[PDB]
Structure formats: structure tokens, C-alpha cells
Design an enzyme around this catalytic site. Structure first.
Site, PDB file in Angstrom:
ATOM      1  N   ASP A 243      40.017  43.937  39.472  1.00 22.76           N
ATOM      2  CA  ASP A 243      38.732  44.626  39.411  1.00 22.76           C
ATOM      3  C   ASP A 243      38.851  45.949  38.672  1.00 22.76           C
ATOM      4  O   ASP A 243      37.889  46.394  38.034  1.00 22.76           O
ATOM      5  CB  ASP A 243      38.198  44.869  40.820  1.00 22.76           C
ATOM      6  CG  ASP A 243      37.720  43.597  41.499  1.00 22.76           C
ATOM      7  OD1 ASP A 243      37.408  42.615  40.791  1.00 22.76           O
ATOM      8  OD2 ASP A 243      37.648  43.586  42.748  1.00 22.76           O
TER       9      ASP A 243
ATOM     10  N   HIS B  56      30.231  41.032  42.969  1.00 25.46           N
ATOM     11  CA  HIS B  56      30.974  39.783  43.024  1.00 25.46           C
ATOM     12  C   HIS B  56      31.536  39.610  44.423  1.00 25.46           C
ATOM     13  O   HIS B  56      31.500  40.527  45.251  1.00 25.46           O
ATOM     14  CB  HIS B  56      32.084  39.730  41.963  1.00 25.46           C
ATOM     15  CG  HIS B  56      33.286  40.562  42.285  1.00 25.46           C
ATOM     16  ND1 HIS B  56      33.361  41.905  41.987  1.00 25.46           N
ATOM     17  CD2 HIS B  56      34.478  40.233  42.838  1.00 25.46           C
ATOM     18  CE1 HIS B  56      34.541  42.372  42.360  1.00 25.46           C
ATOM     19  NE2 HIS B  56      35.235  41.376  42.879  1.00 25.46           N
TER      20      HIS B  56
ATOM     21  N   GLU C 119      34.121  32.189  43.449  1.00 25.48           N
ATOM     22  CA  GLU C 119      33.615  33.551  43.392  1.00 25.48           C
ATOM     23  C   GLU C 119      32.261  33.580  42.689  1.00 25.48           C
ATOM     24  O   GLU C 119      32.036  32.871  41.705  1.00 25.48           O
ATOM     25  CB  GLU C 119      34.610  34.471  42.680  1.00 25.48           C
ATOM     26  CG  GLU C 119      35.866  34.761  43.519  1.00 25.48           C
ATOM     27  CD  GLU C 119      36.667  35.947  43.025  1.00 25.48           C
ATOM     28  OE1 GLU C 119      36.279  36.553  42.005  1.00 25.48           O
ATOM     29  OE2 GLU C 119      37.685  36.284  43.670  1.00 25.48           O
TER      30      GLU C 119
ATOM     31  N   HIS D  75      34.655  38.147  47.174  1.00 26.08           N
ATOM     32  CA  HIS D  75      35.993  37.704  47.533  1.00 26.08           C
ATOM     33  C   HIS D  75      35.868  36.622  48.589  1.00 26.08           C
ATOM     34  O   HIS D  75      34.934  36.624  49.392  1.00 26.08           O
ATOM     35  CB  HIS D  75      36.852  38.837  48.099  1.00 26.08           C
ATOM     36  CG  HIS D  75      37.217  39.883  47.099  1.00 26.08           C
ATOM     37  ND1 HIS D  75      37.783  41.085  47.456  1.00 26.08           N
ATOM     38  CD2 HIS D  75      37.093  39.907  45.753  1.00 26.08           C
ATOM     39  CE1 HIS D  75      37.989  41.808  46.372  1.00 26.08           C
ATOM     40  NE2 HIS D  75      37.579  41.116  45.325  1.00 26.08           N
TER      41      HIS D  75
END
Ligand SMILES: [Zn+2]
Lengths: 57, 130
Positions: free
Chosen positions: B91, B78, B24, B80
Site C-alpha cells: 500500500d 480497498h 480484494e 484486506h
């Protein structure tokens, strides 16, 4: 004398972090504008910023 | 906020870095109001395909740098891996501590943005690619 950034809301530093809802692994602290470690001594008139470590998944 | 304005070259760069990463990716969106003027990638200290945590030293240096430039944190981004860009429960907790716009992307080029209200309810926010 305790500002947590992110939400921007206003002994040693380990206790002031636990006093505001964090620990050494989940936030980083800086006193009078300077980074400090967990058992670093806090003085009576100093200014602390708590920086929550951004995390997720 | 209600809508994220991000320059195309920044969004394209984030997607390219994500497309070839096995872990990630995470970083900051800096700017004014809802508009992205600068991007900073931050080391994911978990080095993990399923979770991220910012390197604290890199994070703090980035925030101090943006402060000097008179920039606000507009959002966090960010990635996935192999699932859609929808906020997870993980999150949710990070969005409470950093209640700004959260841009989520994946390796297939999908991206969506989200915000957490004061009632701790998530809503999707529209993205304008500038
Ligand atoms: Zn996520």
C-alpha cells in the site's frame, strides 16, 4: 507537456512513460485528451497525461 | 488531510460488498476536501485475495466522470481479507502515486483510514460516519 495525475505534477508514448517513471502496465496515457497505446507516435506539440494505475494489497 | 467524512450508507455498502467477496475490492471516494459525496467501485484486474490493481480503462472513465461532475478524488478504498485494516508495504507504494486518504476495510467489518505525508510517513486519520 507531461502531467502525471495523482501527485498532479506537470518518439512513442512508451518512452515518455519510462521518462517519467512508469511502464505500460503501471500507467495509462492519454494524448491531447485521447487514450493512446505504448508504441503510438507522439508529436511535438501534443499534451500528455500519465495516469498511474492504483495498486496495493 | 486529518479526517474522513463518509456517509453511512456508502460505508455500509462497501463493507457488505467486501463481506461476500473472495477477492480484494477497490475503488474511488469522490467529493470535496475531506468529504465523500460519491463512490465508484473498480474492477480488481488481479482477481486476487491478496493484492489489487485497478482496471485502467474503468479507472480512467471514473476519473473523467468525476471531473465532469466537478468532484475531486478524496480517497481510495480497498479491502484486506482475514487481516486487520492496516496499510501494508504494498500500500505504501500506491499511496506515493495517489497521496490521498486510503480507506482500508476487511470482511469482518473493520475499517481504518490512513494518509501518507510528504515525508513518506503514514498516519491514521479519524473517520466521521455521516
Ligand atoms: Zn492493503
Amino acid at each position: 507537456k507531461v502531467k502525471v495525475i495523482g501527485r498532479n505534477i506537470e518518439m512513442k508514448v512508451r518512452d515518455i512513460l519510462r521518462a517519467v517513471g512508469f511502464n505500460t502496465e503501471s500507467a495509462i496515457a492519454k494524448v491531447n485528451g485521447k487514450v493512446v497505446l505504448e508504441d503510438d507516435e507522439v508529436k511535438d506539440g501534443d499534451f500528455v497525461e500519465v495516469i498511474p494505475v492504483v495498486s496495493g494489497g | 488531510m486529518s479526517t474522513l467524512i463518509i456517509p453511512q450508507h456508502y460505508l455500509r455498502a462497501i463493507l457488505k460488498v467486501v463481506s461476500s467477496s473472495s477477492v480484494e475490492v477497490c475503488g474511488f471516494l469522490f467529493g470535496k476536501e475531506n468529504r465523500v459525496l460519491k463512490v465508484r467501485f473498480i474492477r480488481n484486474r488481479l482477481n486476487s485475495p491478496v493484492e489489487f490493481e485497478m482496471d485502467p480503462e474503468e479507472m480512467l472513465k471514473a476519473l473523467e466522470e468525476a471531473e465532469q461532475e466537478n468532484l475531486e478524488v478524496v480517497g481510495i478504498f480497498h479491502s484486506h481479507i482475514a487481516c486487520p485494516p492496516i496499510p501494508s508495504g504494498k500500500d505504501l507504494e500506491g499511496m506515493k502515486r495517489w497521496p490521498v486518504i486510503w480507506l482500508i476495510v476487511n470482511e469482518k467489518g473493520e475499517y481504518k483510514a490512513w494518509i501518507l505525508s510528504e515525508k513518506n510517513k503514514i498516519s491514521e486519520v479519524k473517520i466521521v460516519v455521516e
